[PDB]
Copies of this chain bind each other. A is one copy, B any other.
Amino acid sequence: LVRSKAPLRLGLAGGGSDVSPYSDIYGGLILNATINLYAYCTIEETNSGRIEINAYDAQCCKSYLSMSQLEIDGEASLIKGVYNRIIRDYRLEPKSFKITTYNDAPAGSGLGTSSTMVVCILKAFIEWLSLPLGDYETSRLAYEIERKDLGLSGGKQDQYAAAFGGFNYMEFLQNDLVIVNPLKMKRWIVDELESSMVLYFTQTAIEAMHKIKQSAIDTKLALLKGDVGEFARILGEGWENKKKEAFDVATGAGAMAGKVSGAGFIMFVVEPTRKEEVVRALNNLNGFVMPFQFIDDGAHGWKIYS
């Protein structure tokens, strides 16, 4: 059997500049980082002309006939979605296997859950069938499967982070090319940043989007130098800018700055010696603090020889 896991991510700056058609016309820049919340998958080749699916994340535990393709009932779309593309792209005969899947964060959450799971399933298949697919190809394949085959709309930063891993500076160039600049992060900066962070779960746009894109640049420079204070400043200036309301009762008992991400989730930047104070105050509210650590590795698979 083969197993695989992929990490979820945190958007540090540039969020949105990667989404079409803004990226297509102006070009996007994003700085993100993978965290220790994962999507897992294991694939074991069975010889019962069947395909069993135990997708805890897709509330699905059915069995199907080992076909060449599997219709998208709307159940276990991610797994079926990956499998179908694999059979087509390599023209392989139907396969018999049992596949299990589960995630560390719910569907929404806003941490790239869906893209991370797809990458994770791909990695399993890659390991399971020795597919000639590396980081770039995997991310590409993942996006294509999720954003086209399944008709799911989103940016491009999630597939790549899950596949590549660590702290990345991504350039989304026109003609949908993408450059991933894998950044090495000194251990003290990584530690300082985490001790400075709290994860809390509760036209003229363009002109704004340009500022956001520009923030990816200033944030890179700021964190490379370990200047968390400037990072905090950049987040605030951004928050102020993305307002000129729902639950800012969280920002009420806050720290230095904050940034709101998809799926109802605030990334606070606090003074390390006050981080605990912030976590207790936020914990009194209706939401909860999500403990985490940055993880340097991207998706990967391994085999267990029985």
A residues at B contact (CB < 8 Å): 135-136, 166, 169, 179-186, 220-221, 224-225
Please determine whether A182 and B184 come into contact, CB atoms closer than 8 angstroms.
Answer: yes
Contact yes or no, B224 A181, CB < 8 A: yes
Q: What does DSSP make chain A's interface, helix, strand, loop or mixed?
A: mixed
- B184→A224 contact, CB < 8 A: no
Copies of this chain, complex-wide, total 2
Measured CA separation A182–B185 after assembly (Å): 7
A117 CB, min distance to chain B CBs, angstroms: 23
Contacts of A166 in B (CB 8 A): 184
A224 to B182, CA, bound (A): 9
Give the complex CA separation of A180 and B183 in angstroms: 10
Q: How far is the CB of A139 from chain B (nearest CB, A)?
A: 12
Partner of A181, one of B136, B183, B186: B183
For the complex, give the distance between the alpha carbons of A97 and B169 in Å: 45
Residues of the B chain whose Cβ atoms lie less than 8 Å from the Cβ of A186? 135, 182
By a CB distance below 8 angstroms, the chain B residues around A220 are 181
Question: How far apart sit A28 and B140, CA to CA, in the bound complex (Å)?
Answer: 32
Interface CB pairs A-B, < 8 A, 15: A135-B186, A136-B225, A166-B184, A179-B221, A179-B224, A180-B224, A181-B181, A181-B183, A181-B220, A181-B224, A182-B183, A182-B184, A182-B186, A183-B183, A183-B184
- Between A182, A185, A186, the greatest number of chain B beta carbons within 10 A of the residue's beta carbon is seen for A182
Q: Which residue of B lies closest to A136 (CB)?
A: B225
Listed from nearest, the 3 A-B pairs whose CB atoms lie closest are A182-B184, A184-B184, A179-B221
Provide the bound-state CA to CA distance between A182 and B187, in Å: 13
The interface residues of chain B lying within 8 Å CB-to-CB of A169 are 181
Q: Which residues of B sit under 8 angstroms from A182, Cβ to Cβ?
A: 183-186, 224
Residues of chain B contacted by A224 (CB below 8 angstroms):
179-182
CA–CA, A136 and B224, complex, Å: 10
By a CB distance below 8 angstroms, the chain B residues around A136 are 225
